[PDB]
Amino acid sequence: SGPVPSRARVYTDVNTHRPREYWDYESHVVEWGNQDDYQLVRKLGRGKYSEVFEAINITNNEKVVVKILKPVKKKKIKREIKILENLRGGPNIITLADIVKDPVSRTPALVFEHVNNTDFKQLYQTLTDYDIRFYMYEILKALDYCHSMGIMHRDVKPHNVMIDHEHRKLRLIDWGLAEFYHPGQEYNVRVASRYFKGPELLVDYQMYDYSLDMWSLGCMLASMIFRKEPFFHGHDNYDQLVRIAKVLGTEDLYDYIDKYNIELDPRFNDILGRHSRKRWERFVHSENQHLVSPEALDFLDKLLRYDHQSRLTAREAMEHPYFYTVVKDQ
Amino acid sequence: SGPVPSRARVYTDVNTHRPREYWDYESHVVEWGNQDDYQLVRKLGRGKYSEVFEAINITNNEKVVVKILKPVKKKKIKREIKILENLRGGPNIITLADIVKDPVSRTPALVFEHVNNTDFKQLYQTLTDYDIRFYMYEILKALDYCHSMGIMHRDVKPHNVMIDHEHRKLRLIDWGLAEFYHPGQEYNVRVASRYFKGPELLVDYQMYDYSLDMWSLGCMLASMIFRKEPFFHGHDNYDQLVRIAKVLGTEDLYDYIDKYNIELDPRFNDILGRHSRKRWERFVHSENQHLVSPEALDFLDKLLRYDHQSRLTAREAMEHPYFYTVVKDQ
Ligand SMILES: O=C1CCc2c(oc3cc(Br)c(O)c(Br)c23)/C1=C/Nc1ccccc1
Ligand SMILES: O=C1CCc2c(oc3cc(Br)c(O)c(Br)c23)/C1=C\Nc1ccccc1
């Protein structure tokens, strides 16, 4: 019969009511800048699609960040450029300062505002209960904005959340996997990091929406309050769903499979088995108890759901009793 | 009430006194040549509307340049062909040698005289103060001629100015966006490059004239004397006007808007703000001081005006004290 279609529960037809050039990124003309305005200082890291350097804008002695793109299809480059321009000025969204062509790579190199990042492998172990709520609220402001703009990030993870802890500043980065949401469109399920892949990606349900980003957020929240990064630490795509099934149970998983008439890879038969839905108190101990609370568990439970339709929206999440103390201080 | 109409203050009724077939390019019959007379040697570049090749005319072993047109409406091809033929023989205007259609592909290919171009990204950095004045005077000879012929280029920019520095030769190219001027006609504002769009294009005033080309010339002149490419470096069409307003001030901008009763896109409200008219000394430093002079700043100021009627004409510009040394050498 085929899989049952699905629509986004919020921001469904926002892109349809936009001018074509808003989401038709293939017809976007890149306005290149002067590459000689930036001198590379040092390399900051290497990804699979780019290399990131710290540079200086010699026109005004500003610290910038140059992301030299590894060779990929120009369609994916135009997509990232168009999304960054559409989201420019949004809350906690990284700002694209300029676009230049690199001398050596002969490749697009995106220039961004600099963010003095604190490594999450060092920051998360020092986060208090209030620090987690504050930053979760800042990520939610960025996610709610880009979702309202008809865009899903599809790669939410601690590495893609730059935090300047001294100034309590946060920027959501790495929009190379972001995509415009269109009702009824079937997307590539091989997106995001394996630890943050939603169940819809693991069971290959291609008609997903913004709710994919909310699952990844729950994975981040679980890692921070339980002091286990990553929380679902799987070896592959199949074992990733098994790690999830050992916590959320298998009864809800097969209900999610029966609801959307998803056909399972037969490999999942011999590895999934039967598992009960575990209570979050199982993962609470003396080292993380100061970060776990009834608010945190209720908020986490409303994010980690098999059914992507039943997850909280970014705006609904911002109105949870978990962020009450954050909102009044803001 | 609607926007206030405007006429060109020079060369207003030149096309009206011409025979219809001079400007009625829709009724122009193309004189095709023999496609077998040209053999392509190598590709020189790719644009959005064409591909440029170096070829040889096997009838006389002449180096030529073949511009194979990408698929566009044949009305626009007739327009470009008609303008090039009307302007053939004019000072510093590229010469259309022949027009051919491929037998199999049926695709237009324009044949031009060859010009050994020096890349402006390598040439401009080696230009002296006198070199800039000399070539600016050569561009003005081409603009004054085509304006007197009732044609506006609508895409003046360094990429469209071929320079053979060894022979002190200059040719204005790429007439695909050029159009005949007719009093009272409203034109498409979606022309030229983002960095060289005049204010009338950014506020959507369709009854513009030759003075649009003069604004683009000021943008070129500013980039060359200040060593800043692009000078008005905007992220989009809206931010482009904001970058202009941060230099020319907002007081003159709203006066220009109130004079012609232009209604602004409400998006401009939250981004324009209030800005003072900056002095040109702000962009002068040790690397460009040998190119900046009281004449250059006075000439640039008389070109970059919001009010298109108050900008210098091409002939008025040629009679500026900036080109005094150039004229006596002629
Ligand atoms: O500060 C920035 C700006 C944005 C950005 C950075 O890395 C990226 C990787 C990708 Br992929 C991407 O799309 C973006 Br945007 C960015 C980044 C890193 N800073 C840093 C790192 C280590 C120590 C101190 C500072
Ligand atoms: O001699 C000509 C004839 C006119 C013309 C030329 O390039 C164009 C590109 C476009 Br787009 C266009 O519309 C036109 Br007309 C032209 C050109 C020479 N270019 C060159 C020379 C050396 C290296 C690289 C490029």
XYZ file of C-alpha atoms and ligand atoms in Angstrom:
710
model
C 0.000 0.000 0.000
C 2.952 2.274 0.701
C 3.790 4.569 3.607
C 1.176 6.893 5.068
C 1.905 10.552 4.194
C 2.572 13.171 6.847
C 2.508 16.956 7.155
C 4.166 19.356 9.569
C 1.901 20.294 12.467
C 3.209 23.893 12.379
C 4.637 26.102 9.620
C 3.280 23.733 6.977
C 2.672 26.081 4.025
C 5.053 28.937 4.872
C 7.357 28.345 1.891
C 4.451 27.995 -0.555
C 3.376 31.582 0.202
C 6.920 32.901 -0.347
C 8.287 34.190 -3.657
C 9.849 31.403 -5.699
C 13.382 32.789 -5.318
C 13.141 32.306 -1.535
C 13.293 28.497 -1.735
C 14.362 27.925 -5.373
C 18.027 28.078 -4.408
C 19.199 26.428 -7.644
C 18.484 29.745 -9.410
C 20.393 31.792 -6.806
C 23.223 33.947 -8.178
C 26.189 34.243 -5.819
C 27.632 37.745 -5.372
C 31.309 37.046 -4.721
C 33.455 39.273 -2.530
C 37.145 40.129 -2.434
C 39.212 37.177 -1.217
C 42.187 39.474 -0.567
C 40.281 41.103 2.316
C 40.928 38.071 4.558
C 44.203 36.529 5.732
C 44.013 33.088 7.316
C 45.505 32.961 10.812
C 45.152 29.305 11.830
C 43.037 26.224 11.208
C 40.218 25.587 13.677
C 38.992 22.178 12.519
C 38.175 19.827 9.675
C 34.775 18.496 8.671
C 33.737 16.080 5.964
C 32.433 18.921 3.764
C 34.709 21.833 4.715
C 37.761 23.121 6.566
C 37.344 25.935 9.092
C 39.973 28.632 9.647
C 40.268 31.703 11.836
C 41.039 34.750 9.697
C 41.329 38.527 9.985
C 39.458 41.074 7.868
C 42.372 43.363 7.005
C 39.915 46.098 6.003
C 38.880 46.618 9.641
C 41.037 44.185 11.706
C 38.019 42.038 12.614
C 38.279 38.406 13.659
C 36.262 36.305 11.215
C 35.847 32.595 10.485
C 36.434 31.284 6.957
C 34.795 27.961 6.070
C 36.521 26.671 2.936
C 34.114 24.185 1.364
C 35.327 20.776 0.282
C 34.331 19.931 -3.317
C 30.614 19.114 -3.388
C 27.722 19.581 -5.802
C 27.089 23.278 -6.442
C 23.404 22.679 -5.663
C 24.316 21.918 -2.043
C 26.530 25.023 -1.945
C 23.769 27.292 -3.268
C 21.366 25.718 -0.761
C 23.590 26.525 2.222
C 24.241 30.050 0.929
C 20.541 30.742 0.331
C 19.475 29.417 3.743
C 22.154 31.437 5.550
C 20.986 34.599 3.774
C 17.305 33.925 4.506
C 18.064 33.328 8.200
C 20.496 36.244 8.583
C 19.593 38.471 11.516
C 17.640 35.732 13.288
C 18.037 35.000 16.997
C 21.105 32.873 17.798
C 21.677 32.141 14.088
C 25.250 32.394 12.834
C 25.782 35.425 10.594
C 27.202 34.992 7.087
C 29.462 38.013 6.633
C 30.727 37.423 3.087
C 31.251 34.869 0.320
C 34.613 34.614 -1.463
C 36.395 32.168 -3.754
C 39.560 30.634 -2.297
C 42.829 30.944 -4.294
C 44.004 27.350 -3.764
C 40.796 25.336 -3.590
C 39.055 27.519 -6.237
C 36.058 26.794 -4.035
C 33.440 28.908 -2.260
C 34.599 29.988 1.193
C 31.956 31.324 3.552
C 33.020 34.036 5.994
C 31.239 34.166 9.346
C 31.280 36.279 12.466
C 33.731 34.966 15.040
C 32.494 33.221 18.186
C 34.998 32.483 20.948
C 33.761 28.936 21.477
C 34.265 26.860 24.607
C 34.675 23.173 23.776
C 31.576 21.190 24.722
C 33.799 18.298 25.832
C 35.035 20.728 28.516
C 31.942 22.926 28.941
C 29.188 20.342 29.489
C 30.944 18.831 32.520
C 30.881 22.306 34.134
C 27.279 23.256 33.296
C 24.897 23.916 36.179
C 21.160 23.228 36.153
C 20.428 26.851 35.234
C 23.106 26.930 32.518
C 21.451 23.977 30.775
C 17.992 25.571 30.898
C 19.349 28.911 29.665
C 21.177 27.422 26.677
C 18.341 25.026 25.820
C 16.112 28.106 25.626
C 18.627 29.868 23.366
C 18.755 26.891 20.992
C 14.946 26.791 20.988
C 14.800 30.448 19.937
C 17.030 29.615 16.963
C 15.065 26.477 16.059
C 11.684 28.212 16.347
C 12.896 31.009 14.064
C 14.285 28.816 11.279
C 11.218 26.564 11.451
C 8.993 29.634 11.087
C 11.167 30.514 8.072
C 10.330 27.130 6.536
C 13.779 25.635 7.170
C 14.861 22.564 9.137
C 18.453 22.319 10.339
C 18.715 18.495 10.142
C 22.060 18.496 11.991
C 21.492 19.568 15.604
C 24.318 18.361 17.859
C 26.650 19.854 20.505
C 29.402 20.395 17.923
C 27.030 22.609 15.903
C 26.151 24.814 18.907
C 28.886 27.393 19.483
C 28.766 28.924 22.968
C 30.703 31.924 24.288
C 30.195 31.119 27.960
C 31.824 34.322 29.241
C 29.117 36.416 27.548
C 26.352 33.757 27.622
C 26.182 33.949 23.823
C 25.055 31.115 21.551
C 25.047 30.626 17.777
C 23.667 27.699 15.769
C 26.118 26.776 13.004
C 26.726 24.255 10.192
C 23.737 24.720 7.866
C 25.156 22.466 5.142
C 22.448 19.850 5.744
C 19.599 22.332 6.241
C 16.717 22.141 3.779
C 13.491 23.966 3.005
C 10.358 22.170 4.173
C 7.670 21.529 1.559
C 4.467 19.588 2.351
C 4.586 16.093 0.893
C 8.257 16.151 -0.106
C 10.306 13.038 0.654
C 13.794 13.849 1.926
C 17.077 12.005 2.270
C 17.093 10.017 5.515
C 20.912 9.972 5.669
C 21.257 13.324 7.424
C 22.431 14.507 10.855
C 24.846 12.615 13.089
C 24.122 8.980 13.907
C 23.662 9.676 17.621
C 21.062 12.373 16.899
C 19.245 10.669 14.017
C 15.523 10.560 14.663
C 13.656 7.255 14.515
C 12.120 8.376 11.212
C 15.642 8.446 9.760
C 16.505 5.028 11.205
C 13.350 3.316 9.886
C 13.597 5.235 6.572
C 10.487 7.418 6.641
C 11.335 10.140 4.134
C 8.310 12.430 4.654
C 9.606 14.045 7.839
C 9.551 17.702 8.893
C 10.847 20.176 11.490
C 10.104 17.648 14.255
C 13.361 15.893 13.323
C 15.275 18.789 14.899
C 13.287 18.371 18.122
C 14.411 14.752 18.506
C 18.050 15.822 18.182
C 17.417 18.457 20.857
C 16.124 15.810 23.259
C 19.292 13.795 22.677
C 21.376 16.849 23.601
C 19.244 17.512 26.688
C 19.560 13.882 27.797
C 23.353 14.044 27.487
C 23.568 17.178 29.637
C 21.247 16.245 32.512
C 22.437 12.614 32.717
C 26.165 13.348 32.153
C 26.364 10.817 29.305
C 27.497 12.277 25.976
C 26.241 10.901 23.650
C 23.178 9.406 25.364
C 22.228 6.926 22.616
C 25.752 5.742 21.787
C 25.213 3.394 18.853
C 27.741 1.689 16.592
C 25.681 1.918 13.379
C 22.226 2.920 12.149
C 20.664 -0.402 13.170
C 22.270 -0.506 16.622
C 21.274 3.144 17.101
C 17.572 2.260 16.992
C 18.217 -0.700 19.309
C 19.814 1.606 21.888
C 16.734 3.830 21.604
C 14.375 0.846 21.821
C 16.015 -0.301 25.066
C 14.905 3.001 26.662
C 11.669 4.042 24.927
C 10.472 0.442 24.574
C 9.496 -1.527 21.488
C 5.703 -1.350 21.893
C 5.622 2.331 20.925
C 8.107 1.679 18.105
C 5.900 -0.911 16.402
C 2.867 1.329 16.946
C 4.774 4.100 15.159
C 5.621 1.578 12.434
C 2.011 0.394 12.145
C 0.607 3.939 12.132
C 2.600 5.106 9.090
C 2.728 1.638 7.455
C 6.526 1.686 7.409
C 8.112 -1.566 6.262
C 11.039 -2.480 8.492
C 14.397 -3.651 7.238
C 14.300 -7.390 8.093
C 17.631 -6.910 9.890
C 15.714 -5.099 12.646
C 13.762 -8.291 13.402
C 16.638 -10.237 14.977
C 18.064 -7.257 16.905
C 15.059 -5.269 18.137
C 13.291 -7.932 20.185
C 10.987 -6.948 23.041
C 11.877 -4.136 25.443
C 9.827 -2.301 28.047
C 9.646 1.486 28.304
C 12.183 2.388 30.983
C 11.676 5.112 33.575
C 14.132 8.008 33.546
C 14.969 7.370 37.216
C 17.097 4.450 35.976
C 19.699 6.888 34.598
C 19.764 9.127 37.702
C 22.679 8.792 40.121
C 24.640 10.863 42.625
C 26.817 12.558 39.983
C 23.966 13.934 37.824
C 21.091 14.260 40.318
C 21.610 18.024 40.670
C 20.688 18.389 36.974
C 17.679 16.021 36.892
C 14.315 17.321 38.098
C 10.616 16.597 37.480
C 10.602 19.510 35.017
C 13.619 18.176 33.111
C 12.201 14.650 32.862
C 8.754 15.858 31.782
C 10.317 18.121 29.147
C 12.683 15.385 27.937
C 9.853 12.838 27.721
C 7.801 15.181 25.523
C 10.729 15.480 23.068
C 11.893 11.852 22.698
C 8.920 10.300 20.900
C 8.833 7.796 18.052
C 5.864 9.543 16.416
C 7.314 12.753 14.985
C 3.832 14.314 15.051
C 3.627 13.916 18.848
C 6.873 15.727 19.686
C 6.776 19.245 21.081
C 7.192 22.091 18.655
C 9.964 24.584 19.345
C 7.419 27.171 20.496
C 5.581 24.663 22.704
C 8.932 23.700 24.240
C 9.695 27.346 25.059
C 6.423 27.505 27.042
C 7.289 24.525 29.314
C 7.607 24.901 33.115
C 11.267 23.891 32.667
C 12.170 27.347 31.299
C 10.019 29.315 33.770
C 13.042 30.535 35.738
C 14.859 31.345 32.491
C 11.954 33.349 31.058
C 11.402 35.522 34.134
C 15.110 36.392 34.266
C 15.045 37.195 30.536
C -1.307 59.811 -6.496
C 1.468 57.648 -7.907
C 5.134 58.342 -8.606
C 6.198 61.598 -10.231
C 7.300 61.071 -13.859
C 10.786 61.931 -15.053
C 12.567 62.616 -18.334
C 16.227 62.524 -19.272
C 17.675 66.026 -19.183
C 19.881 65.196 -22.195
C 19.226 63.041 -25.276
C 15.535 62.935 -24.372
C 13.860 62.730 -27.796
C 16.669 61.239 -29.899
C 14.836 57.971 -30.599
C 11.548 59.747 -31.367
C 13.231 61.534 -34.287
C 14.635 58.228 -35.599
C 12.901 55.891 -38.053
C 10.867 53.202 -36.308
C 13.232 50.398 -37.346
C 16.090 52.039 -35.417
C 14.593 51.221 -32.002
C 11.807 48.746 -32.908
C 14.095 45.764 -32.413
C 11.188 43.297 -32.229
C 10.770 43.759 -36.000
C 14.500 43.313 -36.704
C 15.503 40.523 -39.094
C 18.864 38.984 -38.201
C 21.469 38.789 -40.971
C 23.025 35.384 -40.365
C 26.520 34.532 -41.558
C 28.290 31.287 -42.363
C 28.904 29.326 -39.163
C 31.545 27.246 -40.986
C 33.828 30.311 -41.245
C 34.853 30.086 -37.566
C 36.667 27.335 -35.668
C 36.619 27.492 -31.875
C 40.075 27.442 -30.283
C 39.367 27.479 -26.536
C 36.829 28.637 -23.968
C 37.485 31.986 -22.284
C 34.734 32.074 -19.658
C 31.144 31.381 -18.698
C 28.413 33.878 -17.893
C 24.800 33.408 -16.906
C 23.577 34.310 -20.414
C 26.429 33.120 -22.649
C 29.699 31.239 -23.060
C 32.717 33.039 -24.520
C 35.221 31.318 -26.810
C 38.318 32.384 -28.697
C 37.981 31.404 -32.350
C 39.727 31.896 -35.683
C 38.055 33.109 -38.879
C 39.417 30.538 -41.332
C 38.565 32.881 -44.211
C 41.365 35.265 -43.188
C 43.066 33.664 -40.128
C 41.748 36.403 -37.831
C 41.509 35.985 -34.074
C 37.872 36.542 -33.074
C 35.676 35.987 -30.016
C 32.516 33.872 -30.288
C 29.811 34.468 -27.669
C 27.460 31.477 -27.784
C 24.180 32.649 -26.272
C 22.460 30.545 -23.640
C 18.718 30.018 -24.291
C 16.855 33.312 -23.847
C 13.815 34.951 -25.421
C 14.519 35.815 -29.059
C 13.182 39.328 -28.416
C 16.170 39.908 -26.121
C 18.551 38.582 -28.788
C 17.141 40.960 -31.409
C 17.585 43.798 -28.904
C 21.260 43.024 -28.270
C 21.934 42.577 -31.995
C 20.139 45.810 -32.916
C 21.984 47.877 -30.299
C 25.394 46.489 -31.291
C 24.737 47.272 -34.960
C 23.492 50.793 -34.203
C 26.582 51.460 -32.059
C 29.069 49.814 -34.442
C 32.029 52.074 -35.149
C 31.502 54.162 -32.019
C 34.399 55.137 -29.761
C 35.470 52.333 -27.401
C 32.415 50.240 -28.362
C 32.961 46.543 -29.041
C 32.553 45.635 -32.717
C 30.051 42.953 -33.725
C 31.787 41.187 -36.607
C 29.192 38.543 -37.494
C 26.190 36.558 -36.265
C 25.905 32.813 -36.865
C 23.484 30.021 -35.970
C 24.662 26.468 -35.455
C 23.012 24.136 -38.005
C 22.303 21.391 -35.487
C 21.714 23.279 -32.230
C 20.106 26.355 -33.858
C 21.788 28.485 -31.221
C 22.876 32.108 -31.757
C 26.605 32.838 -31.669
C 27.773 36.461 -31.788
C 31.227 37.110 -33.265
C 33.281 40.035 -31.949
C 36.679 41.585 -32.511
C 39.359 40.156 -30.242
C 40.698 42.218 -27.331
C 43.671 40.923 -25.344
C 42.112 41.631 -21.956
C 44.035 42.092 -18.720
C 42.080 40.903 -15.686
C 40.940 43.924 -13.681
C 41.629 42.023 -10.450
C 45.290 42.057 -11.550
C 45.278 45.275 -13.614
C 43.577 47.681 -11.190
C 46.121 46.899 -8.464
C 48.865 48.110 -10.839
C 47.057 51.235 -12.078
C 48.514 54.642 -11.262
C 46.544 57.841 -10.681
C 46.914 58.811 -14.344
C 45.942 55.336 -15.584
C 42.613 55.593 -13.753
C 41.871 59.057 -15.161
C 42.783 57.986 -18.701
C 40.572 54.889 -18.721
C 37.680 56.634 -16.958
C 37.810 59.151 -19.811
C 37.698 56.295 -22.333
C 34.636 54.788 -20.640
C 32.978 58.218 -20.713
C 33.532 58.504 -24.474
C 31.665 55.219 -24.936
C 28.849 56.211 -22.566
C 28.363 59.664 -24.106
C 28.178 58.111 -27.575
C 25.616 55.418 -26.751
C 23.543 57.900 -24.737
C 23.537 60.291 -27.700
C 22.407 57.299 -29.777
C 19.484 56.837 -27.376
C 20.799 53.702 -25.644
C 21.602 53.028 -21.983
C 23.958 50.181 -21.107
C 22.374 49.342 -17.710
C 25.292 47.081 -16.717
C 28.451 49.182 -16.369
C 30.961 47.355 -14.160
C 34.652 46.334 -14.278
C 33.777 42.936 -15.780
C 32.165 44.690 -18.775
C 35.191 46.935 -19.481
C 37.857 45.137 -21.519
C 41.270 46.830 -21.324
C 44.365 46.021 -23.402
C 46.925 47.837 -21.262
C 49.881 47.287 -23.613
C 48.100 49.218 -26.386
C 46.083 51.575 -24.123
C 42.871 50.193 -25.641
C 39.448 49.982 -23.987
C 36.170 48.442 -25.162
C 32.770 48.457 -23.452
C 31.192 45.010 -23.807
C 28.167 42.925 -22.755
C 25.208 44.837 -24.223
C 22.668 42.137 -23.344
C 20.945 44.376 -20.783
C 21.147 47.589 -22.828
C 17.880 49.222 -23.866
C 16.672 52.159 -25.935
C 15.525 55.171 -23.920
C 11.999 56.441 -24.576
C 10.477 59.396 -22.677
C 7.902 58.218 -20.160
C 8.663 54.508 -20.524
C 8.922 52.466 -17.325
C 11.766 49.942 -17.359
C 12.684 46.811 -15.444
C 14.468 47.646 -12.188
C 15.974 44.131 -12.043
C 19.070 45.013 -14.065
C 22.811 45.403 -13.431
C 24.830 43.808 -10.627
C 23.860 44.230 -6.978
C 26.902 46.360 -6.159
C 26.267 48.724 -9.098
C 22.470 49.064 -8.896
C 21.447 52.707 -8.751
C 19.196 53.954 -5.951
C 16.316 54.268 -8.434
C 16.584 50.514 -9.038
C 16.656 49.713 -5.311
C 13.564 51.799 -4.457
C 11.765 50.559 -7.615
C 11.475 53.741 -9.675
C 10.942 52.442 -13.202
C 11.067 55.750 -15.133
C 14.854 56.081 -15.124
C 17.209 57.099 -17.934
C 20.871 57.259 -18.985
C 21.827 58.624 -15.547
C 21.678 55.046 -14.230
C 24.926 54.342 -16.094
C 26.524 57.357 -14.402
C 25.837 55.941 -10.933
C 27.532 52.676 -11.915
C 30.525 54.693 -13.124
C 30.847 56.318 -9.705
C 30.833 52.856 -8.139
C 33.707 51.827 -10.420
C 35.598 55.060 -9.730
C 35.152 54.709 -5.964
C 36.489 51.141 -6.023
C 39.575 52.132 -8.019
C 40.640 55.237 -6.092
C 39.793 53.772 -2.660
C 41.062 50.210 -3.328
C 37.750 48.726 -2.149
C 36.025 46.070 -4.282
C 33.078 46.262 -4.072
C 32.641 49.748 -2.571
C 28.963 49.307 -1.643
C 29.188 45.695 -0.440
C 25.587 44.715 0.254
C 24.155 41.314 1.117
C 20.966 41.765 -0.939
C 19.006 44.463 -2.761
C 17.641 45.871 0.507
C 20.986 45.843 2.330
C 22.556 47.402 -0.777
C 20.531 50.579 -0.244
C 21.459 50.516 3.452
C 25.167 50.419 2.583
C 24.602 53.414 0.298
C 22.635 55.236 3.005
C 25.477 54.710 5.493
C 27.731 56.785 3.192
C 25.466 59.294 1.419
C 23.219 59.728 4.465
C 19.491 59.170 4.847
C 18.361 62.816 4.741
C 19.012 63.071 0.999
C 17.481 59.621 0.449
C 14.101 60.568 1.923
C 14.210 63.873 0.033
C 14.697 61.873 -3.171
C 11.757 59.676 -2.144
C 9.494 62.628 -1.321
C 10.404 64.482 -4.528
C 9.275 61.676 -6.857
C 6.499 60.416 -4.528
C 8.087 56.970 -4.386
C 6.418 54.543 -1.992
C 9.012 52.506 -0.113
C 8.803 48.784 0.473
C 7.885 48.550 4.194
C 10.916 46.274 4.661
C 13.124 49.368 4.287
C 11.665 50.914 7.462
C 13.466 48.728 10.016
C 16.833 48.697 8.203
C 17.417 52.218 6.871
C 17.279 54.212 10.096
C 19.072 57.552 10.323
C 22.585 58.064 8.955
C 24.641 61.190 8.360
C 26.371 62.021 5.082
C 29.937 60.791 5.539
C 33.027 62.575 4.249
C 35.126 60.793 1.631
C 38.258 61.140 3.796
C 36.937 58.201 5.842
C 37.918 55.803 3.036
C 41.398 57.311 2.490
C 44.408 55.487 3.939
C 48.100 54.949 3.211
C 47.489 52.329 0.499
C 45.173 54.472 -1.670
C 46.328 58.029 -0.899
C 48.321 58.254 -4.147
C 45.046 57.769 -6.065
C 42.827 60.155 -4.050
C 42.895 63.878 -4.821
C 40.554 66.866 -4.395
C 39.557 66.479 -8.057
C 38.782 62.766 -7.696
C 36.602 63.296 -4.619
C 34.795 66.257 -6.195
C 34.166 64.259 -9.377
C 33.012 61.192 -7.431
C 30.653 63.293 -5.297
C 28.995 64.736 -8.414
C 28.337 61.208 -9.757
C 27.034 59.410 -6.644
C 23.742 61.228 -6.079
C 20.366 59.789 -5.116
C 18.542 62.151 -7.482
C 19.273 60.746 -10.939
C 18.511 64.146 -12.474
C 21.273 65.789 -10.412
C 24.020 63.396 -11.536
C 26.581 64.501 -14.099
C 25.951 63.659 -17.718
C 28.667 61.799 -19.600
C 29.627 65.008 -21.416
C 29.613 67.064 -18.209
C 31.847 64.417 -16.622
C 34.345 64.612 -19.499
C 34.717 68.366 -18.846
C 35.680 67.980 -15.149
C 39.054 69.222 -13.823
C 39.827 65.558 -13.058
C 40.432 64.849 -16.767
C 42.258 68.133 -17.480
C 45.658 66.435 -17.718
C 44.139 63.629 -19.800
C 42.547 66.014 -22.312
C 45.678 68.081 -22.994
C 47.666 64.894 -23.662
C 45.009 63.897 -26.225
O 33.398 30.790 15.679
C 33.005 30.115 14.716
C 32.108 30.830 13.733
C 31.109 29.887 13.056
C 31.592 28.518 12.764
C 32.676 27.997 13.499
O 32.949 26.697 13.056
C 32.064 26.371 12.053
C 31.979 25.161 11.325
C 30.992 25.064 10.350
Br 30.822 23.414 9.307
C 30.109 26.110 10.089
O 29.139 26.001 9.121
C 30.227 27.288 10.831
Br 29.017 28.739 10.483
C 31.197 27.455 11.827
C 33.387 28.692 14.537
C 34.389 28.212 15.389
N 35.002 28.994 16.358
C 35.954 28.560 17.370
C 36.331 27.202 17.386
C 37.248 26.753 18.352
C 37.785 27.620 19.285
C 37.414 28.964 19.270
C 36.498 29.414 18.307
O 37.570 40.411 -27.236
C 36.491 40.146 -26.686
C 35.248 40.501 -27.464
C 34.094 40.900 -26.545
C 33.950 40.087 -25.320
C 35.087 39.448 -24.785
O 34.718 38.743 -23.634
C 33.365 38.918 -23.418
C 32.573 38.390 -22.371
C 31.218 38.708 -22.366
Br 30.060 38.010 -20.951
C 30.646 39.518 -23.342
O 29.304 39.820 -23.316
C 31.462 40.021 -24.358
Br 30.683 41.142 -25.714
C 32.834 39.740 -24.429
C 36.415 39.515 -25.346
C 37.631 39.067 -24.813
N 37.701 38.454 -23.565
C 38.853 37.836 -22.917
C 40.150 38.046 -23.340
C 41.243 37.441 -22.700
C 41.017 36.605 -21.607
C 39.723 36.385 -21.172
C 38.625 36.990 -21.811
